[PDB]
Each structure stands twice: as structure tokens, then as C-alpha cells.
Amino acid sequence: EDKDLRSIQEVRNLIESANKAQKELAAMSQQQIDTIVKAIADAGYGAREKLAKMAHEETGFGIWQDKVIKNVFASKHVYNYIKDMKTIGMLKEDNEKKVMEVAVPLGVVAGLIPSTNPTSTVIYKTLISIKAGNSIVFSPHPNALKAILETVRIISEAAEKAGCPKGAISCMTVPTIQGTDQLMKHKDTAVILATGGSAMVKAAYSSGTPAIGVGPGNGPAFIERSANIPRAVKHILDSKTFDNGTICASEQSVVVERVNKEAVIAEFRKQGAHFLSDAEAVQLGKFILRPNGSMNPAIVGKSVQHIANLAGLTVPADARVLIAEETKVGAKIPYSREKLAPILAFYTAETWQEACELSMDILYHEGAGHTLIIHSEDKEIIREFALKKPVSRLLVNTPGALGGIGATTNLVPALTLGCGAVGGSSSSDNIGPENLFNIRRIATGVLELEDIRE
């Protein structure tokens, strides 16, 4: 009866079921696997509306119409990338080196699901884990529980119809920290896909189980002197306002040069941004930064009007983002940190070199290894940013949120965006099927001992 014990029991039950379900997947051919993958894609996509509405209603986060596009992306876009990849059995036979390469599935994948992008992340993690021959057990955020449970129900039913063994795709029905702890620590858990906060990722790397973790997204968008101002402002608003800023790859600040500063402020205003007065900025800043130095969860995925009301603000009805001018960087400077909300800091640099230095300083305090955006027509400046910005994905003339996940760019389509070693993670990739299998190499003898000691 006690909730944590039942949760720990259920976790042990799901992993066991998932372990034997994977052994059955492992026996399947590439064609049999792809038949399953396409069926998960279709069920995910067919239920795009219902799951998007479910998630919005339960979490109170975002915009259901935007969650639909997240579901479409997680289904069709990921499917289209992964459909023709060889991920199963014999991959390569080098007949000159005499080395053969075979894909080995990891085993049971433990997927931690955020409340910010719940149904889309479930679909994405399922497609890529099953594609690589793995079973997946999900850890749902308590306040997106029903949405995630129905996503798992819908996609696992379609997979099982297409030949997938029962138990290969499952989810905790009783969310506890103790339960999630067990899922992570379990001997028969092969890898943790750790999409969550910084304490949750640190836990996953302290679990004993190999983990693939994320960091906070604190991505500046530098609008450089040669950028088309209208297009840059459009890209940023497209991303920042997408699902009320729930995607980690969305812009957290705008950096402008002195030459374009006012031209950019005016364009933001013209496209519906609201600039906070100095007084309005500190008032919201006081509300955003909690006494313990945490960022206020009360803003996450909420509307501009919702956030204004919480902060004691009165803001125009058609305001699309709140923007505050910022000069400093630090743990006590909330505008310099991740605000999963339609709230942006606004920085001014005199030159592109000053903008690079400020971005480094922003990223080093928070957001290193994740995302930075640059709007520019200058090939030389973009290349300097490419060689120096401490991120894993550097986005050029594109909306941040959409560009970072590979919706508007040719990055790998993903909702797990690895932050690399600088962010404390084991990978910097947009996670796909190639991150979820090992290579076994089968090598023939080419030399004798007598050759190597001569």
C-alpha cells in the first residue's frame, strides 16, 4: 500500500518485463524493426491533437496548437530521419581490414520525461530506442502523468499490433522519487536518457548506470550588424513564443550591437514585444529569482498575461514576449538565466567582439554546451562564433527552439539535446538511434607476435 514501496515494486516489475521483451526485439531483423517503428510513428501522429490537448490541460503549460506541432515533429520528422538508417545486426564488413561491425542494442533504456514537452518526448524516445533494438521504461513527471500514460498506451498498442513484444514500451503509473531512483540504479537498466533539471541529470551520472544527460538552455541570440532585422525578430518570436517557451533551445537573451540597437527594439515592438521599464524589470526579476537562488517554476510555460499578473504587472493585452534590458551576468541576475517562459533579457554590445565575449560570460555562468543563436550575413563572424562559442549547437538565421531540435535546420531531429562534457554530459549530439547501440567488432588476425617484436 505505501506509495513509494508500490512505486519501487512497479519499477522492478517493468524493468524485468522490459528486459525479456528486449531479448525478443534483439532477435528481430531490420525489416521487422522498421515495421514496428513506422507503426509507432503513425499512432503518435494520429493522436497528435488529443495528446497535445491532454498535456496542456494537465500541466497548465503552453499552447495546445503548438504542442500539436511538437507531436508532428516527434512523430513524422523523427520517422523520416530514422526510417532508412541501418541500426540492426550486421552493419559493415571491411574485407581489407578484416573487421566486421554489428549493432548491439543497449538493452533497457530508462527515459525520464519532462512536464514541459511530455507527449512529444515520449514519442521521440520510443521511436529511437525501438529503432536501435531497445526496450524503454518511462519515468513521468507527476504533473504530466496522465498525458504520458495515454501516449505510452497509444504507441505501445500500435507497436504490439505490428509485431513488437509486450512490455518493450512501458511507463511508471506511480511517480515517486524513490521509484525513479530505482529505475536509474537498477542493474538491468542499460542507459538513462536524462531529460530534466540539473539535479536530475547529476543524479543520473551518480546512479551507477551509464547516463546521457542534458543541461540548461540559456541561449543568447546575437543579432549582428548585417542581419535583416525583420527576419531575425520574426525568428526569435517564432521560437520564444512557441508553446510559451517550453523548449530548452529557445532564446534566453538578445544581444544587439550599438548600430542596430534601436532599430531592433522598434522591430520587436512592431511585431508585438513588450519592453519592461526599469521598474517593471526589477519587479519581475524579484519574482523570478527565488530566495534559494532557484528560478520560479510558476513562470514555466505560462502566458505573458499570466506571468504579468503573478508579478504585479499591467502589460498590454497583445504583448507576445516580455523583454527586459540587462547589463550583468550572475547567479543573482535572473535575466541572465534560463526562463522557460516568453521572457527575454536584452543586452547591448558595442561590437561583435564585445558580443562574443558577453555570450561566453553568459554561457559560462549558465547554459554552456547547449545552444547559442546568431543572426548575421557575415560568413567571417559566424565562423569565429563557430570556433569559439562554448555550445554544442550554434544556430544561424533560424528560430532557436525549432532550429536546435532540428525542425528548421538539418540537425538530427531530437528532443534530447546533449550538452557535452562542458555541461557535464557524455554526449553533445542531438540524440538519435546511433547513440543507443554499441558496435561489436569482429576482427581477423593480420600479424603474428613475431611480427610485433621485430
Which residues from 279-318 bind Cl ion, rule CB under 5 A? none
From 164, 171, 248, 356, active-site residue: 248
The closest residue (CB) to Cl ion is 120
Partner that binds at residue 267, options Cl ion, a copy of itself, none, CB closer than 5 to 8 Å by kind: none
Task: Yes or no: say if 127 and 37 are a contact pair by the CB < 8 Å rule.
Answer: yes
Residues preceding gaps in the chain (C to N > 2.5 Å): none
Using CA atoms, how far apart are residues 254 and 265, in angstroms rounded to an integer? 10
Out of 85, 102, 263, 298, the residue judged to bind a copy of itself by CB under 8 A: 102
The piece of 280-288, 293-301, 303-311, 385-393 that touches a copy of itself (CB under 8 A) is 385-393
The answer to whether residue 255 forms part of the interface with a copy of itself (CB under 8 A) is no
Phi-psi region of 368 (alpha: psi -120 to 50; beta: other; left: phi over 0): beta
The answer to whether residue 263 forms part of the interface with a copy of itself (CB under 8 A) is no
Which residues from 344-383 bind a copy of itself, rule CB under 8 A? 369, 382-383
- Other CB atoms within a 10 A radius of the CB of residue 145 amount to 20
SS3 169: strand
**Which of residues 51 and 103 has its CB atom nearest to Cl ion in the complex?**
51
**Which of residues 90 and 282 has its CB atom nearest to a copy of itself in the complex?**
90
Q: Using N-to-C axis directions, what is the helix angle for 30-46 and 145-161, rounded to 10°?
A: 140
The piece of 111-119, 216-224, 354-362, 427-435 that touches a copy of itself (CB under 8 A) is 427-435
Task: Yes or no: say if 118 and 135 are a contact pair by the CB < 8 Å rule.
Answer: no
248 is catalytic: yes
The answer to whether residue 251 forms part of the interface with a copy of itself (CB under 8 A) is no
Cell of 202: 547529476
List the x/- string, 207-246, binding to a copy of itself by CB under 8 A: xxxxx-----------------------x--x---x----
Q: How far is the CB of 379 from a copy of itself (least distance, A)?
A: 10
Task: Yes or no: say if 148 and 169 are a contact pair by the CB < 8 Å rule.
Answer: no
**Which of residues 141 and 375 has its CB atom nearest to Cl ion in the complex?**
141
Nearest to 61 by CA among 244, 310, 320: 244
The answer to whether residue 56 forms part of the interface with Cl ion (CB under 5 A) is no
- Other CB atoms within a 10 A radius of the CB of residue 179 amount to 24
Q: How many Å from the N-terminal Cα to the C-terminal Cα in the chain? A: 70
Cell of 78: 523523427
What is the DSSP track for 112-173? EE-SSSHHHHHHHHHHHHHHTT-EEEEEE-GGGHHHHHHHHHHHHHHHHHTTPPTTSEEE-S
The answer to whether residue 168 forms part of the interface with a copy of itself (CB under 8 A) is no
The answer to whether residue 125 forms part of the interface with Cl ion (CB under 5 A) is no
The site for Cl ion, by CB under 5 A, has a size of 5
Using CA atoms, how far apart are residues 267 and 348, in angstroms rounded to an integer? 15
Which residues from 45-84 bind a copy of itself, rule CB under 8 A? 65, 69, 72-73, 77
The answer to whether residue 195 forms part of the interface with Cl ion (CB under 5 A) is no
Out of 7, 17, 115, 119, the residue judged to bind Cl ion by CB under 5 A: 119
Active site (catalytic) residues: 248
